[PDB]
Every structure is written in C-alpha cells, then in structure tokens.
C-alpha cells in the first residue's frame, strides 16, 4: 500500500494502476481533505480525472479515516451523457462502492426521494445530473453529504444560474470540481467556480471584479497602454498565487 501524511492509505493495486501525475493528484485531493477545503481538478481533458477521484474516494473508504467513518454519502453531479461512464469507471476501479444513478434512466424504479434517502443512509455514491440538482435541491440537501464532486463543474460558471445557486447549497466543505477548462469566457466564471469550492478566497463578486477582472482584462485589449499591461500582469500573478493551492491543472 501507499501511505500519506496522517492516516490515508490507498491500496497498492489501485495505486500501482495510476500514473505519476494521477497519484500526485490523489495526494493533492487528500491535502484538500485535510484542510477541509475544496478544489478544482483542472487537468485538461483526457488526462483522467475520473480515475484520480475514484482512487482518492477508494482510499478514503479503505483508510477508514475519521463524523463519517471512511467515506460518507457522496454526490457526483455530471453531464447526463457520462453518468453511466462514471458508474462503469467506479465498477471497474473500486467495485465495493454502491454507485446509484439519480435519473429517469437510473436503475431504481421507486420514488427518487427514496433513492436519495437510501444513499444518504448507506453511504453510497449518488450520481445525478445538473438538471436534477436544480430540480430536487429540496431533497438533495437534507442529508449532509460528504463530498460534492461536480464533474465538468464549469456548468457552475454563471453565478446566477439556478443550477449554480443549487450546487452552492451543500453544507459540506469537501467540494470538488472536475473541469479541464475552468475558465471559458472571462474571470467571472473562475470566481463562480472558486465561490463553489471555497466561498471566501476570491471575495464577493464586487471585490473580485474590481480587483481582478477589470484590471486583468483591460491589459489584454490591443490598445492597452504599458502601465495597464503591467497592472494586468501584477493582478494575474496575484490571482494565480491566490488560487494556486486549490487548482490542480496538468
């Protein structure tokens, strides 16, 4: 087995399967756990973020760390096309997990609220979609989930979409975002993502916009004077420093 700083072991076979950067990522996820912070697995598409997440969750269940003993009831919110991709990857990589789908397709065939209840009370992985998170926040948030992995979490990039407000209703500290592109049109999207994983770091959207978005943007227009370019460089350095501990982007 591979052992990390405090009590976190990941099985030797599960660990051997991973690559060097994926196990760096499993480490990084677990320091996030130790500090009770969220973060953005920003490794770009195809590098394997499902596997780092599954390996970390498996080592979280396997290490029996101490409220929840090991892994609690976690929710994975993903685009509708990959819910079954997630189920497949969980069943091949860590079969002991109970991985339910919260969808019409699903596999349950009873009241969905019953599925959410059962997964909350048997510490399963509930795989749902962003649409369902919007529609069933009344039920999805009455159960004190242990992790709130959002796959392709850049669907949270609009701070005012209903999905965004919904996903920001989980009381848990262990929020994770999987998105190889956690910035798509502007810095407001980055603020929204970081406001999900760690609400305070970037300030209120007032402060973030005035301190970072207007400066960092205004130094990229072609006509930008040198002074304003240098301000943009300075503010970009500050922003990268601020978000360094919580973004892992290979």
């Amino acid at each position: 087995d591979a052992e990390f700083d405090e009590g976190f072991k990941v099985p030797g076979f599960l660990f051997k399967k991973l690559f060097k950067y994926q196990q760096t990522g499993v480490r990084w996820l677990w320091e996030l756990h130790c500090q009770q912070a969220g973060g953005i697995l920003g490794d770009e598409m195809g590098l394997g973020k499902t596997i780092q997440i599954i390996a970390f969750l498996a080592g979280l269940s396997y290490s029996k760390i101490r409220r929840f003993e090991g892994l609690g009831p976690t929710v994975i919110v993903c685009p509708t096309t990959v819910m079954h991709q997630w189920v497949k990857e969980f069943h091949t990589w860590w079969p002991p997990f109970r991985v339910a789908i919260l969808h019409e397709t699903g596999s349950y065939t009873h009241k969905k609220e019953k599925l959410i209840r059962d997964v909350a009370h048997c510490h399963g992985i509930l795989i749902t979609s962003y649409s369902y998170i919007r529609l069933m926040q009344d039920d999805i948030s009455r159960y004190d989930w242990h992790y709130v992995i959002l796959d392709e979490g850049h669907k949270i990039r609009n701070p005012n979409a209903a999905v965004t407000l919904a996903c920001k209703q989980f009381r848990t500290p262990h929020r994770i975002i999987l998105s190889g592109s956690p910035m798509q049109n502007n810095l407001r999207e980055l603020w929204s993502l970081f406001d999900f994983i760690f609400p305070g770091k970037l300030g209120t959207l007032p402060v973030f916009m005035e301190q970072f978005s207007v400066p960092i943007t205004m130094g990229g227009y072609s006509n930008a004077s040198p002074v304003q370019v240098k301000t943009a460089y300075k503010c970009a350095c500050v922003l990268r420093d601020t978000i360094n501990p919580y973004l892992l982007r290979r």
Binding site: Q36, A37, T172, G200, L202, G203, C237, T242
Partner: protein, 365 residues
C-alpha cells in the same frame, strides 16, 4: 527570597520555581515608575502599543493624530533614570503618514525589520523598519478597527483585519491577496486575534455581541460561536449565542493559547475555553469599559500565576486570569486608558491613554 535562592542553589526546587515565583512577585509589585519616562511625541491619544516579540527592545505606538512612534526601551545611559527615547517616527511630514487615527500597530513576528499598522484612513500599511518606507498598502472600503498577524505562523503571513464592515478581511502579505473574507458577523468587527497555539485559528469579536472562532483554512464557516450560558438559553442560532450583552471590543488569548479573554461594553470580561468556546464562568467582577473602538489588553507570561491587564477607565486593572481575583488597579493616567502592553522579560507594563502619555509600570524594588 533567600529561601528561594537556597532552594535553587541546592537543587531542592527547579529553577523554574524561582523564576516564576519571582516574576509573580514583580507583577504584584508593579507600580508607576517615575524612575522611567517615555518621550512624549504624540499630539493625540495613544491607541496602540506593540513591543517587538524578539528581543523585546523596541516599542511601536500609534496615536490618534496619525503619527507612529518607534521607541527604544533599553536604558542605554549609565544613569538609573532614563527616558525611552523615540528612535523613529512616521510623522506629519512623512509622505506615508496616516491621514487619521492609527488604531493598531504590530511588529512582524519572527523579525524586527517589518511592521504593520492600520488606520481609520481605511488602510493597512506595511512598513520596512530600516528604510521606514511603506512596502505595501491594503486599501479597504471601510475604516479599520484592528488588525493582527499570527504570532506563530511560520507558514502563512495573513493579516486578519476588522473594519466597520461585517466581514473579516484576510490580507496575504506574500503575494498580495486581500480577497479572502470571513463572513458570518453582522456588525463592525472590533477585535481580531490569531490563536498563539494554532496557525490558522482566528478569534474575531464584533459589536453584535458575538465572538467567533474561525479556521481560515476551512471552507465551511466559523468553528465556534461563544455563548455566555453554554446552553441554558438555547435557540436556533439566528440571534443568540452572544459572548456579551453589548459590543465585544477586546480579545486576548492567554499565554498558552488554551483560553480566550473577551471584554465587552456590558462592563464584563469573560474567560472561554479556546478549544470548544465554553465559558469557564470565571467571575472577574465588573470591568468598566465603554470604548467605542477596539480595546487592547494583554496577559502576563512566565509567572507562577497568569495575569490580565485590562484598561479600566483611567487605571489599568490587574486580575488573575484563572481565579478572577483583581490583583490591583494601577492608577497613574489622567484620562481613559486605551492600550496596555506587557514586556515579558522584566514584568514591565506600558500603557497608553487619551492624555497623550505612555506610562511605564515597573516592579518596585
């Protein structure tokens, strides 16, 4: 004293015994030293004092006139009488001088070369001691009541800043990041203090009668909200769990960092368990404060019994932390006392006041 010397020399008692019992004797004998004076440089009331943690030689002072004074507390003259001369001063002609009252000044822990000061001009300025020029300025939208650097953080260099805003600003001196905010208070934060024990534990006290303990690493809000009664009056937390029945304008961790002392405008001082925020029910009597800003008070260190020196109107009231028994009240100021700071090497106290004086209290004999 001769019994103590004989017991030390012969090994009966650990030398720690003599150190602590004698330091306690020196604290009980603390009295206004007219055999030491501090040079008057402030045109306004002294709001804050900070003796450097390493070597305890130099003192900072922030006045209501916006000047910062840097004093030498070592008696470099061969006389038994000396005045603590003012080495430096950020004066009315200094281009970086604060435009309004300096409400807090703090040495950088771990090194004397940098110190930080916050003002009602809505700035926290970082100063390089040697060149005495600002290295950084953190502008805030609202006037600063109190800032504090962790006395312990070998890892992070965050400054917790409390302004009239309901949020606590965390400013990273390492690459300048003033975006982090701790939200959960509802009124002006009148006092902030990092735990001396835990690198990332911050205690914040606000005019809404609430004191909160935070883990600035954590992404899930305040750890603890101090409650007077510990559950006797229990309510779904929307307005209850107040530390005081007024504004809480002073915070001070005990030396070992296992307890928290709060003073509020209910004319009370309370002692709390800093791990679970449980009131220890130490009485302390009545502590007259009606300060409308942060009230800086200190504790003793390395004595047989710990003490707390709290500004009590124009006097400095000395209490035993863990029994509440008021040792005494040091009366030598002419107006209300704003701040006291303890020199832990010689059990000396310095106290500033609105009467534009800084008085040294040294043990008698």
């Amino acid at each position: 004293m001769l019994g103590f010397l004989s017991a030390r020399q012969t090994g009966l008692e650990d030398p720690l015994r003599l150190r602590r019992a004698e330091s306690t004797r020196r604290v009980l004998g603390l009295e206004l030293n007219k055999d030491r004076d501090v040079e008057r440089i402030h045109g306004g009331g002294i709001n804050t004092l900070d003796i450097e943690p390493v070597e305890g030689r130099y003192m900072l002072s922030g006045g209501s006139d916006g000047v910062i004074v840097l004093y030498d507390l070592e008696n470099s003259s061969r006389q038994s009488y000396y005045t603590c001369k003012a080495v430096c001063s950020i004066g009315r002609d200094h281009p970086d001088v604060h435009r309004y009252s300096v409400e807090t000044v703090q040495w950088y822990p771990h090194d004397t070369g940098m110190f930080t000061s916050s003002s009602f001009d809505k700035t926290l300025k970082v100063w390089d001691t040697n060149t005495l020029q600002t290295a950084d300025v953190f502008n805030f939208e609202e006037t600063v009541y109190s800032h504090h650097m962790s006395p312990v953080s070998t890892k992070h260099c965050l400054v917790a800043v409390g302004t009239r805003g309901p949020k606590v600003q965390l400013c990273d001196l390492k690459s300048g990041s003033c975006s982090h905010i701790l939200q959960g208070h509802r009124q002006e934060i009148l006092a902030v203090s990092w735990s001396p024990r835990y690198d990332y534990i911050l205690a914040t006290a606000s005019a809404d009668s609430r004191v909160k303990l935070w883990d600035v690493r954590r992404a899930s809000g305040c750890l603890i909200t101090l409650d007077q009664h510990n559950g006797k009056k229990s309510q779904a937390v929307e307005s209850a769990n107040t530390a005081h029945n007024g504004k809480v304008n002073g915070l001070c961790f005990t030396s070992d960092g296992l307890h928290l002392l709060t003073v509020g405008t209910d004319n009370r001082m309370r002692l709390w368990n800093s791990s679970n925020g449980e009131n220890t029910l130490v009485n302390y009597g009545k502590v007259c404060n009606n300060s409308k800003k942060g009230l800086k008070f200190t504790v003793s260190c390395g004595c047989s019994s710990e003490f707390v020196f709290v500004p009590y109107g124009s006097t400095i009231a000395v209490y035993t932390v863990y029994s509440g028994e008021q040792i005494t009240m040091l009366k030598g100021h002419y107006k209300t006392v704003d701040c006291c700071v303890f020199q832990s090497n010689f059990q000396e106290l310095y106290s500033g006041s609105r009467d534009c004086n800084i008085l040294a209290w040294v043990p008698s004999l």
